[model samples]
Target: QPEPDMITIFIGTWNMGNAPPPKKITSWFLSKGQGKTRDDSADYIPHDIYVIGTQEDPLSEKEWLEILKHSLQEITSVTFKTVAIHTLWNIRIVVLAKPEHENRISHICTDNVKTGIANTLGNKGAVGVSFMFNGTSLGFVNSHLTSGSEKKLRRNQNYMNILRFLALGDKKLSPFNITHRFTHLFWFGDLNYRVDLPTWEAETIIQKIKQQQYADLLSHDQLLTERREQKVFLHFEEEEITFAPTYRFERLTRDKYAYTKQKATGMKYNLPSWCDRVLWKSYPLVHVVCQSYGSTSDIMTSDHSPVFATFEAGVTSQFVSKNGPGTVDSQGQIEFLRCYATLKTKSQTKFYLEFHSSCLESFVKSQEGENEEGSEGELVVKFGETLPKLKPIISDPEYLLDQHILISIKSSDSDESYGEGCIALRLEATETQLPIYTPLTHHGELTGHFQGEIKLQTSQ
Candidate 1:
């Protein structure tokens, strides 16, 4: 039920002052200074997913997630569900996905790496999530690094900490040295990587905000220099940030950088800089293209302005899975578990089968919904020619692979006899479901009028 082969992603990063947002956040998706009127804006493409990164967020994770979900739904009128959310301290990252594409995303996991001053403070750190979309695995990191004009090295060290952090089952959430783990990765935050110049020169960089000239000042950006020298983010790619600086804004001014309160109190205001940003990298056979990147010019709630970016990701039809050809979750081999059953002629017949399979993803949709794209087939039970029609009590029992069902089977025949009866049901299924099972038939001891136990062929 997904829309098309192309997938559009929207990324937003902000440090909301633990309060509400503006009446119009649709501008976050549009270019800066271009949202004055809806008719004058660039063509806005419909999005398939929304990725939100936060630092010092005012609301709780649950509240913010619900708020964002409701906000986007109201603005776009498109149905979106929170597929994954992660939080550590005040930093949080949320992914809202289209309901139609939910099944195509699996192996969802999350991790948080704390890096605030000897890792003791919960106020600063990074949170990330990993999932396989369609066939491509992706990693997303939202961080709030150490802050200061000359704390570039400290921010780099925090990045390293984020890289090394791990979660349950030894999965690298950041996918640092394990770059092969992800087909594409996105990183965004209030990085706090300041301009390398003095306060006066840094202040002068904002003077050209009217002319949209940031290249000259960007040349002296601490993060840019470090990335060029392989000091950090060696292989990532970022769009040319032609927008004005996004930090140290005033309370009521629509476009000014510094607050008057600081000057009145004789306190030095922090130099305006491009602190909020987004960057990404893609592996072979996977192409991540940036459509636009800019900051929100209208919202002035906090000193930091929100940054947003749009992307179009290309996924090859021949993409391969990192968990091997027949596995999805990196845990253990996901093979179907055994199914146990008992047949009773009258009042009660209870059966339960709990299982795991590489092809057992609920989000995957195709012709059968049970098996698709090289996955195994579903399990079937045959009551043989003479027995009354017995139905497996399950929702869509035909799709029983990788399912845990509380099953009930009853004789459709109104006059079927229960006494002196022993039954045999054949079990058969395809390899795509990677069928697993116990003995096809368990022989019951000879009772009145019943012969020796029945033997049914086992499922292959």
Candidate 2:
């Protein structure tokens, strides 16, 4: 419950095409510019993030970048940190530092890490630095990666190849192979695909990206499998409050759509979510609150309304700031206390870790999701699973190697299974191993689960 590091991450996507005549979105435009202020600046209090000129507009990428540069400059005071606009695409991503980290973050980019260009024409994808924290720095990248075409596919493949380059792809990024320090990665750029969407049925761009290299931030075994397991692998839960159904060239309100429905009989005004979203990846997510119209079709003036959210980055992630989340209110704190208070009760059903001969994880051997590289390194398992106390074997200081159980002193790993002689799930302390009792909790819970690659530390 006591976390060492936590930062809010805001991911957004907006369309900034030319404001049609009558400037139907002038009010929205003016409001966004004025939206950035002293309060809630991390999320656009006085002005919204992007206001791109029409594609036909004479402004070049440099000119657009200049505007993005100037406006982001104003919000960097402990609120909005750094901002950037993609050269090839017109999307803007800005990071706002927490009050204390403002001085630490000075440039539009605090990093210079590059993942080869997404375009084969050699259009480079940027790995720009946005802010710097203590040891690690927050890197913000912008890419309007080829949007689904034969050419775009090749470009995406290259993009993934480049990301592999970032993680030292060829060598393999395992604890055994990696040398570079861990960097907090937060990437966003109209990732054009959602697994659940039917349109992605035959062939989808997002799926292609994932197959190539990029993993969907939202996809994890805990979400896709573990949670679904409870409902017998049912589809996503019923739409409770309001789920963001991002793409709907037809709907508005429920989703972020452009156009003044009241006035225009025709939609020289209407625009749908052909492609726009705010999402993230690989971080312990806390809260995600997305508002449809931060400005409006009437504001910074675009067909697509802005969709923004409030969330803290991973505790260990570089340095990202926030307003809406991570500030535990009285009720939120009480909920936290409640979860912490019942740790003993909840942890009873959870297992710290498990082991099996076959590497691929299973409900019997895994507490979370299955490992990608299953049992490849399962040498020995001192699975802390408590078992019934049958006549114990040799009771040493480190291990109580009994006939029916294995109490961990330290379990060593080998190319094959380790401690095969005494494979046992220790069950004791009056808390029996009832596999039937494992349950999934929604909202909040005391148990924790992990299914990462093999980690080799002494079982002591």
Candidate 3:
């Protein structure tokens, strides 16, 4: 049986070398014969999510985004929407998802960190986007580290800085660090880690690459070496590279590596390396299977070829009773509740509410609290600017009649407790009705009031 909770994702990273957007990039997104003749019936698998990251990108972000949108929409029948896009100077990350997943995704956030020229420049830094998809939290980071054959230490430090400084979402809800905050985390871009071999040996490896031998060369890769020694990218995983080096290629050339000769020595200066890469880490209970990992040779606009990886990410789903709402399955009888709420607070302090029901959790934030309009100037806060369309899965629907869904209102800045209350999930309601005001108590005193309505939703 096919798994409904598994979704395929495609991630591509490239250092464009400030090249202008290409007119056509179908081959980069879809699977065609890598270097062979293109066939219409080639095994092409469309991804549920597409993540494209670029380093040293061209100045025009609009042009680049439009080009990407046009290219993807032209060849595929599936409709894709830009979920999120963020940039840090020349470094950019774009996330696209199928429209069917719009309701299942939430908590979209972006952040960046600078690690260049005393940590003030965007030339070498990381840009990130994080979101919750079908109950799984995912994070994507695109970074460009220091570039040099001997700057291994600097590159390691750059990786550390990006992980430590880039905060994606609310600190109280998630960890401040990116590595531990998400269920699955992907890091990709022009890492600029070079091969640690002598010139003579490196030249020999280039010849071996022509013979389709990459194992020997990959052994000396700086990133792999550091990872093996636990010096960087601890617990991260990468697929075995079967393609040629992605960096130091001659501009506008398909296979030629950049090698210029000095007049006095008659030796090549630029050594080929796999500077562009993609790596991923995932938490326990979630499985990520790498479906494909390779480089696209057709794109020759940049000095580095684009590297792509596809994965089937598995998510946890709640079990629903096949008999009825009261019958129990092996797991339990579960149903989803689409909730909406409006609240009023006395303080001018910004606040948000955290909803917790069984294993499902979500948050709803208030709008600006400064604009209070009432006879007494009280802050009438809307739960969220656009009330969250969160579907919190509730197990044992019968049990919720006695218990209630917990809601905690907290200050956005200080994360201090403002008030707490519970909403009884009465599954018997058939029609939507106006929300009834409920009192919220803090330390046995009424602090605020909220009103909400909940409707049962089919399993998503």
Candidate 4:
């Protein structure tokens, strides 16, 4: 019954470059000097939350989600559930939380920004999610920027754009404070910052690093230099990395630097660098304790190795709400939900809105008269009158998986007016089914109301 003192979290990132995962994935979740195996009761337990991200992933959103979910189940217990999964082009991120702390996570929202061609395309960008857990705001950003030693300046600009433009809800009203908003935050991915040294000179530094002499070389890391000069990542903190470089590996050998490929292809001998990274900032009244940080070398599916870190948060139960009055009434509501308006192609797309069914019904009953008789209700979605019609796939007491509200988007072939809009799935009474062309539309009447807003971006 006493207050819990701490919660643990694991963060990771990798750029697969569109390669497939191995048949058996291996990860080092437990620490050294802990003599327990993963199958038994270990000296340490699994973290409370896992925030994992990938870049240049070839798989679809659902495919990657299933892969990560399967890995989590194999390593942790079956009680772990996915709280959110977000993507923009090649960047994808997923959040998994234990059941005990799942209900404490709420107000989930997402947004993305592009830094690819002309800073408008989705090829290279960041995807983020923000939520309130235990009354303390938290955020996670997974990004991939321009990838060249000469492009560090562009990478810094991309970071600034991510800080300035990526927003949730209305862009002007609720701008993302990725730089200063959340109490505890994590930013990770293939940032593509290089080591400022020639290949031959960097090889000398690598030789010294093998003998445990690396400080002089780390001083020339582009990311380290930019941070010290306050050019980008203004206040973030990254743990000292004692590991070797994670980028520009040989795809064939999987352990050697890509010098053979560079030499054979007449390309520049790409100097090895630490391109993948995981950093954190625990703001005022919060303490983020770093336990471990390192790069995994066994994952040979890509040219870059993945990075992982473990943290313990000094968060007490006093910050959490247990059936407290804030967003929901007597019965509980959906603690975390993701609404997406995604573009499938230049011509078509779909809108998926998920939430609690009972909460939705309560809103509907309150909108229309609770005692109205024989009322046939319709989920009147208002995405503004200017755009195309959004027809509901299932409206009558029909619920897809009891949570999802999927709507077919009828779009013009070349309209680019896809932006932010306030969304309300309200219930309105109709005299009859009106031949809505669906058999399920002829059911009972109970006008329901759902309150929410969303911003539509494109491509996973």
Candidate models: Cα lDDT each: 0.57, 0.28, 0.69, 0.57
* Clashes per model (N, Cα, C within 3 A): 6, 38, 0, 5
Report the lDDT tens digits of candidate 3 across residue range 1-460. Answer: 3325788888889899888746777777764423222236633545788999999898576787787777777766666888899998899999998777777778899999999575535479999999888556789999999887878889888888888788884465431256555668899989998877787665686797788787888899999998988678875799887778887887877667764445632454557788988899775436698877778877888888888887889754333445333332233322323222234555566666665443343444433332345566555655432444444334344433322344666777787766655555444542244243445654323456666555444232
| Per-residue accuracy of model 4 over 1-460 as CA lDDT, tens digit each | 4544577888878888689876544463442211111233542366888888889888888887777777766766555788888888879888888777777788787888888565446588898887766645578889898877878888988887776666642232221245445657788999989778876685686676556565776788899998988677765799887777777776634446663235554465567788988888664335687877877656778887777777878653322223222333222222212222322123223222222122133221011111112224332333321222222223232121122221122223332222212121221222211111110100011113323232211111
Ranking of models by lDDT: 3, 4, 1, 2
Give TM per candidate.
0.64, 0.38, 0.67, 0.64
- Cα lDDT tens digits, model 1, 1-460, are 3334468788888877455666666667553442121223434444777899988787777778767877677666766888789888778899988787777778888988888564546578888887777655677889898877767888888877775563421142111132224556788998888767776564466776557777777888888998887677755789887777777777646567772235553464467677888988665334578877877777777777788888888642222334334443333222222222232222432222221112333211111111112123322223222221112212121222222211122223332212212121222333233332221111111111211122221122
RMSD of each: 19.0, 16.0, 14.0, 16.7
lDDT minimum window of 10 residues, candidate 3: 332-341
* Model 2 CA deviation exceeding 4 Å by range: 1-7, 18-100, 106-131, 135-137, 148-159, 165-184, 194-274, 283-296, 299-304, 314-460
lDDT of 2 at 70: 51
Best by TM-score: 3
Query: What's the CA error at residue 189 for candidate 4, in Å?
Result: 0.8
Q: Report the C-alpha displacement of residue 253, candidate 4, in angstroms.
A: 4.5
lDDT of model 4 at residue 439? 9
lDDT, candidate 2, at 290? 30
Which pairs clash in model 3? none
RMSD of 4: 16.7
- 3 against 4, candidate with superior TM-score: 3
- Cα displacement (angstroms), candidate 3, residue 132, comes to 0.9
For model 3 the TM-score comes to 0.67
